[PDB]
Amino acid sequence: GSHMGDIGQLNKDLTDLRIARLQYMIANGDDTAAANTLAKLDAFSKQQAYLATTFKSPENVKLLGELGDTISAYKLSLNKMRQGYDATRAARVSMDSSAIRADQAMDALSQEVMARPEADSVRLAQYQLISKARQQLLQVRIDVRGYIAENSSANEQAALRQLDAALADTDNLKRQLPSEDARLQQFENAVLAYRDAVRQFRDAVANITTSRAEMTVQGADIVKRSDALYQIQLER
Amino acid sequence: SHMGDIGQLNKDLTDLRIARLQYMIANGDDTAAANTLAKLDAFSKQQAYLATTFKSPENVKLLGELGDTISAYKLSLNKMRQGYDATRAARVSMDSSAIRADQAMDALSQEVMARPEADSVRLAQYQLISKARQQLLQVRIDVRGYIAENSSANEQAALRQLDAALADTDNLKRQLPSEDARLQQFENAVLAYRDAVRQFRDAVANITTSRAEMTVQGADIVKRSDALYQIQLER
Ligand code: NA
């Protein structure tokens, strides 16, 4: 009954892989957890390969072949999820740096105005406008971070609309303060890059969700075939 | 046939472990909580069923041990659920306190313009009001960073930055002695916000604790279930 035992080891390896992959997502797809998942996958793959050499009956060797095919597909889906998580990380890094660049551009502009020898009433009006723009972008960051924490289409779309509204108002501000165009453009270009990064984060979340949906199917398929190997052995 | 019955038990167990992790991935939302509760009593039911049909004393005791761990698991899962509820409550509280603070700061900056004074003084005042506004906005960004990624580093950075905001809000009253009432209103709201960040932090701790407990319970349940399975196999 040793072969029945071998299948026990395989089915345990499967559960362990499924648990590991969910842990990986819980850990926000971090590199440490990715290592652990890759390990559980290799343990499961190694055991499939091992039994492919030791089982002898044609229907068993074939079922093991089928299991091996799904394991190959699973490795590809898992790779896509990993690329997905890397892309969300890269996007977040890009958002942080683009935001800082934007704020610094407004920071430099505000102190360039506080330095100017023009009328106080003029400086006051200008400072009010600039601060309103800085704070609008900060609220956009709050919305985007809300979306990063909770990836709903509702949070996505709200963030995207509010970001476009800030870009629109930045266009307008350029017309209102033409003397400061050079600076406003620094700002706007950074906000445009920030928007590119938010879109990249959104697209990466989609790829993660797609891969997950794929491994859900593969897991169900692997469970099915491994169950069938088990039943054959039990029948002996 | 009893071997098959344990088969069902072991499958229900896996389905429960899978469901509970899905629950956490779903940010502990009520829909996935419902699904987890459902997998839990499917497994509980199978334990209870088998407790009536298995006859060997050693099997019956194994099923009783399983049942005890199920009872503990339900309590831990309940603690996790309460934690997610608390994180959600704290977030609601953070949002409302932030809005209240911002409105107080709006009313402060707009009964500043209604007062007759020099423009240079008006420019100096708006500079520090805006400085305080943006400071709190940045704190919210830090706190949302923490909500997305619950690290000790993110936690502590947010807490420090929040304490610096409260410190500067005391200083702002020194610089705008005329507006002490309104700044106190602002300060109250930021203190309440801090209370809420701390409440969120404590609830995360409780989720983590219950998670660690269910990890242990799961390994205990797997062990006992495997033992039932081996008895049938050697039979
Ligand atoms: Na009050």
Q: Which domains does chain B have, with CATH numbers?
A: 1-86+203-235 (1.20.1440.210), 87-202 (1.20.1440.210)
| Disruptive mutation site among A124, A130, A139 for chain B (greatest number of B CBs within 10 Å) | A124
Sign of torsion, CA A106 A109 A115 A120? negative
Across the interface, do A127 and B122 touch by the CB < 8 Å criterion?
Answer: no
Residue with tokens 């985007």: A144
Amino acid identity of residue B2, one-letter, is H
**Which residues on chain A place their C-beta less than 8 Å from a C-beta of chain B?**
1, 4, 15, 18-19, 22-23, 25-26, 28, 114, 119-121, 123-124, 127-128, 131, 134-135, 138-139, 141-142, 145-146, 148-150, 234
Nearest by CB to A127, from B126, B134, B147: name it.
B126
Query: Would you tell me how many other CB atoms lie within 10 Å of the CB of residue A35?
Result: 10
Which one, of A5, A39, A10, lies nearest residue A223 by Cα?
A10
> Do B185 and B27 contact (CB within 8 A), yes or no?
no
> Do A196 and A181 contact (CB within 8 A), yes or no?
no
Q: Quote the minimal CA–CA distance from A122 to chain B in Å.
A: 10
B95 is in an annotated binding site: yes
B5/B66 Cα distance (integer angstroms):
15
Which one, of B121, B31, B128, lies nearest residue B84 by Cα?
B31
Per-residue three-class SS string for chain A: CHHHHHHHHHHHHHHHHHHHHHHHHHCCCCHHHHHHHHHHHHHHHHHHHHHHHHCCCHHHHHHHHHHHHHHHHHHHHHHHHHHHHHHHHHHHHHHHHHHHHHHHHHHHHHHHHHHCCCCHHHHHHHHHHHHHHHHHHHHHHHHHHHHHHCCCHHHHHHHHHHHHHHHHHHHHHHHHCHHHHHHHHHHHHHHHHHHHHHHHHHHHHHHHHHHHHHHHHHHHHHHHHHHHHHHHHHCC
Q: What are the phi and psi torsion angles at B55 (to 5°)?
A: -115, -35
**Tokens for A53?**
């050499």
**Tokens for B49?**
């069923």
Declared resolution, Å: 1.8
Residue A146's closest chain B neighbor by CA? B144
